[PDB]
């Protein structure tokens, strides 16, 4: 989902990828419902392309002209980060050079 609807690296890519755990900085005892990712999109992204549009997802028969409802959903959903989450469900901090 991250490699298709969010951030895509080209196959002919030169550079480094550096990630480190960041549970200290972005957890909050209550959920850190502030990060968000794109869940629904009608096609794959192109390499090094960025999409920030909301554009309610059709996914049905009714057009849903700008209004959310049945089969029409908001594509951006929030991560739930808590300090008690196990490794693999707690934040990681990524820089790509």
């Amino acid at each position, epitope marked *: 989902k991250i490699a298709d609807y969010n951030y895509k690296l080209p196959d002919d890519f030169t550079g480094c990828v550096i990630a480190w755990n960041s549970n200290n900085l972005d957890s909050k005892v209550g959920g850190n419902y502030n990060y968000r990712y794109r869940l629904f999109r009608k096609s*794959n992204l192109k390499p090094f392309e960025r999409d920030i549009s909301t554009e309610i997802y059709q996914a049905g*028969s009714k057009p849903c002209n700008g209004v959310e409802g049945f089969n029409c*959903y908001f594509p951006l*959903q929030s991560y*739930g980060f808590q300090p008690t989450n196990g490794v693999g*469900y707690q934040p990681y901090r990524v820089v790509v050079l």
Partner: antibody
Amino acid sequence: EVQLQQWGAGLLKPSETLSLTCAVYGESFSGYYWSWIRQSPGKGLEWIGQINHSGNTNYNPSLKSRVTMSVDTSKNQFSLKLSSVTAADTAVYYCARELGHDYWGQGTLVTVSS
Amino acid sequence: EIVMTQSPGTLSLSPGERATLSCRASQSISSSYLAWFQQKPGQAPRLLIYGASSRAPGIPDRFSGSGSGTDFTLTISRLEPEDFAVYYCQQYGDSPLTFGGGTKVDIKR
């Protein structure tokens, strides 16, 4: 209204390749994702993957290494290939539209035995 | 891969009563994106509740849903003879789309 009709072999021997095909009538084929879902009495409903008309596929991480999906746009069909089949793949397979929520196929039973 | 757990699968109750089915998840569901499915034997599942509160078009108004966070429940106000089936959860606020386990409602004697 969408009508989904699916067909495929119902008996396989171990280490064979499962092939199923679903055909869509009534609505536009493009602009949607088409999904495959199995159901087994042992565990329950499980989502396998989905594909759109351009050939972009989303796969379940558990079955990412032995699932392939194809699309035939001329005659509005999409097909599933599940390789290295095993006796644990006996289930009922449905073809649905997008996440479901509106339209489902009738579902075909697949049994694997020697 | 959110693991969805559900109320014990077997529960028996007479017709014309209130039926409550509970559902929970390992992680919190974003935007309360939970759906309830009803499946009669030999047929594909059918949608009842989407968004954990709303009702699908053309659905009888004896079905209600309520919940948030990691706890949800479905309520049938009055049981009809054709209201006995298998009920399933579904979360779709996460990329790996997962269902529940299934709860079967019976007629008691």
